[PDB]
Design a binder for this molecule. Sequence first.
Ligand SMILES: NC(=O)C1=CN([C@@H]2O[C@H](COP(=O)(O)OP(=O)(O)OC[C@H]3O[C@@H](n4cnc5c(N)ncnc54)[C@H](O)[C@@H]3O)[C@@H](O)[C@H]2O)C=CC1
Ligand SMILES: NC(=O)C1=CN([C@@H]2O[C@H](COP(=O)(O)OP(=O)(O)OC[C@H]3O[C@@H](n4cnc5c(N)ncnc54)[C@H](O)[C@@H]3O)[C@@H](O)[C@H]2O)C=CC1
Ligand SMILES: [Fe+3]
Ligand SMILES: [Fe+3]
Lengths: 383, 383
Amino acid sequence: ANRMILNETAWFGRGAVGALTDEVKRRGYQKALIVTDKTLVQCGVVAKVTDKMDAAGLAWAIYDGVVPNPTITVVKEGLGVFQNSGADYLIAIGGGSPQDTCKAIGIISNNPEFADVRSLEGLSPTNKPSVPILAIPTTAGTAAEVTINYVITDEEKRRKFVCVDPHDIPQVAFIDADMMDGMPPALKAATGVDALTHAIEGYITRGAWALTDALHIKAIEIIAGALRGSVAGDKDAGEEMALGQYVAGMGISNVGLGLVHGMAHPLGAFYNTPHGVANAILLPHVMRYNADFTGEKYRDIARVMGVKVEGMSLEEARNAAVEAVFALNRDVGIPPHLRDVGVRKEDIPALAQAALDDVCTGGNPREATLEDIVELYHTAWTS
Amino acid sequence: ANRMILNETAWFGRGAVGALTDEVKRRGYQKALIVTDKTLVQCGVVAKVTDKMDAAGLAWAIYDGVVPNPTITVVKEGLGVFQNSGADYLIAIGGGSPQDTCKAIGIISNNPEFADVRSLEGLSPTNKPSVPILAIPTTAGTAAEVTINYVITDEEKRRKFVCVDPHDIPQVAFIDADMMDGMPPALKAATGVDALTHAIEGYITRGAWALTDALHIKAIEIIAGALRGSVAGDKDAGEEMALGQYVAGMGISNVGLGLVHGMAHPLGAFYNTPHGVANAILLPHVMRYNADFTGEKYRDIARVMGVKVEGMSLEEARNAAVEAVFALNRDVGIPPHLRDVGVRKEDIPALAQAALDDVCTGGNPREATLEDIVELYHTAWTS
Ligand SMILES: NC(=O)C1=CN([C@@H]2O[C@H](COP(=O)(O)OP(=O)(O)OC[C@H]3O[C@@H](n4cnc5c(N)ncnc54)[C@H](O)[C@@H]3O)[C@@H](O)[C@H]2O)C=CC1
Ligand SMILES: NC(=O)C1=CN([C@@H]2O[C@H](COP(=O)(O)OP(=O)(O)OC[C@H]3O[C@@H](n4cnc5c(N)ncnc54)[C@H](O)[C@@H]3O)[C@@H](O)[C@H]2O)C=CC1
Ligand SMILES: [Fe+3]
Ligand SMILES: [Fe+3]
């Protein structure tokens, strides 16, 4: 049998954060800890929520210490603010980094044996649900609001580790493009291809089945349709991307991903490479590597990405799918090679071993060897 | 903004009820009340769940008094067994009748100000979540396991009233075609066309948006592909219908339905007509009435139902969708006229008024007058 974990409640569309004060009142919560970063405070994005909470008379404290690729230290610091704040629920405002920190704080607060953070790695043996989380994405996006995953950086051991726990699922997600409009174009581009990576890896993952196939192929269609227009500053394209990135996530934790995420995690751990940039550069190379193990699925991908596939052979469709992703990456200004974003040739042996042992790599339709992963990093590194 | 309420957890596939004991243990529940009917006890369908519960040492009591089109008396009987059992959770085993009775019992047990039952009608102003519900459908189906709706018959006032309450959403759904295989072919036919009615009414309802459209057009495609095969006794077609019927309901309470359900409810209240047969007879007549107010959507419906719509005018494709629904009804042996299933001409004025005032009617994409609803009943009445 196949399990699907989703948000019990989700609000979609421009103005969705306007639903938050009535959700809090109906749930009888007394005090929020807002988990976010300094940039979202500075840019007035957090104020779009706190101004509504102030007018409704709802108490909140804030922790804005989250950094990209959030660390054990960031989790322990936010846990300290939660405990000393007396909050009874959490509001995650931001991208994957704040939403992942928020999941870690919520789990540990109701399962305090995990306050070391490291022991959460894998299928966390937690007894209690997380503190209730209201999730508000500001990128489009990681779909952190709908997955049961969170990823923490172990600075000491130079590795990203994945915590997988049904207990961490947010009670409500608010998917509001108003919260996302302030993304610089380069951030729309990188988080957008992260979302496309989730959709493509999900579609072809080993555990794929009828319902996840329907959700993931629709996500690819929405994202391929909207991402260029969103990067160019189009308002409606922004709202499409906000939905597209969510739908892409409805499969990540439920069926899995593959070698793109497996090879991206070690780059974040070694270099603090932005997750979306790493995925975008690797995606088309891993798609080429996987092509022979995906049945007819690359014809579907090609088709919804605007390729005329009618009258192409399977081989021609498979090449057209890979080229369509190369083309998207060029159109939205993603660098084409790993050397361009600060990777070192000398690190590839270590990167490959980390990638081979990453949990995401298990879902890859073609079984990956150390030798194959070394060769793929080399193929992605330079001209 | 658009709200989506879904099951936080769902299990899909033959063997899915195999997940129930581990879900109960992980949630710390002490004692179930099983809400079901005599037929499902008698034919051994309840045993498929209780034998697993017994092997895991889980406590359960049973209420098997549910009747089709469940009444206020049936809710009060089940409520009495729940309150006296000392149960802390509910397991709904059966079609829409036991699942709806279970939601009423769950809501009233934590909200005793509504124990008269009829006060729940509409958007129930409940303060507290239902007693936790684990939902196991045995028809394919009402999607009662994933909606926030339940429908109770007020015998004294001779009306089916719809209750709408986010507090009633089941914690876990177990969608297991093994629990459905025993349906007589005629019950597979009727509940299958109820599922198709949910998907079609959902696709064209006033509140339809991008995410519900994607789910609904997928449900129509799955049901149209599988229903004939399932009625004929095909195992795999039964599994596809189990998924299809569920996907069909992911929109029902999130966006709404229309005049088919609006017109089916009074037949249930007056005659105890099977809900599925009432919907199946009315569906193509209501589709014809609605056609001009559905944009391009009937072309989509016709296409996934197996019609070649390439080169058809919108006018021809709208007729082709209506005719594809008439043909499915003929093929699975649903009677074509309301006279054939116990309706009286003399009652149509009274049925029309009850239909005009039904919750579901408001979602219909064409504005319906009493006079329009009278004419529609007369059209479905006889040749
Ligand atoms: N929970 C899960 O299932 C998943 C986890 N992840 C994790 O998510 C992280 C990546 O998060 P991302 O969303 O890509 O970025 P992020 O949360 O790391 O943020 C990147 C930068 O963008 C800024 N930013 C975010 N929203 C902004 C806005 N609206 N306007 C202006 N600046 C804004 C942030 O302040 C930050 O400086 C990684 O740590 C990755 O491991 C990724 C995929 C899925
Ligand atoms: N949650 C909601 O608001 C919604 C629920 N409904 C409600 O659902 C009700 C109808 O429920 P249905 O599922 O159509 O049927 P049902 O639950 O009324 O059952 C019909 C008959 O079939 C039998 N049966 C069920 N499963 C069987 C199996 N596997 N093998 C053999 N016999 C089996 C039952 O014991 C019963 O005698 C109506 O009252 C309708 O209003 C309809 C739409 C949505
Ligand atoms: Fe990702
Ligand atoms: Fe129905």
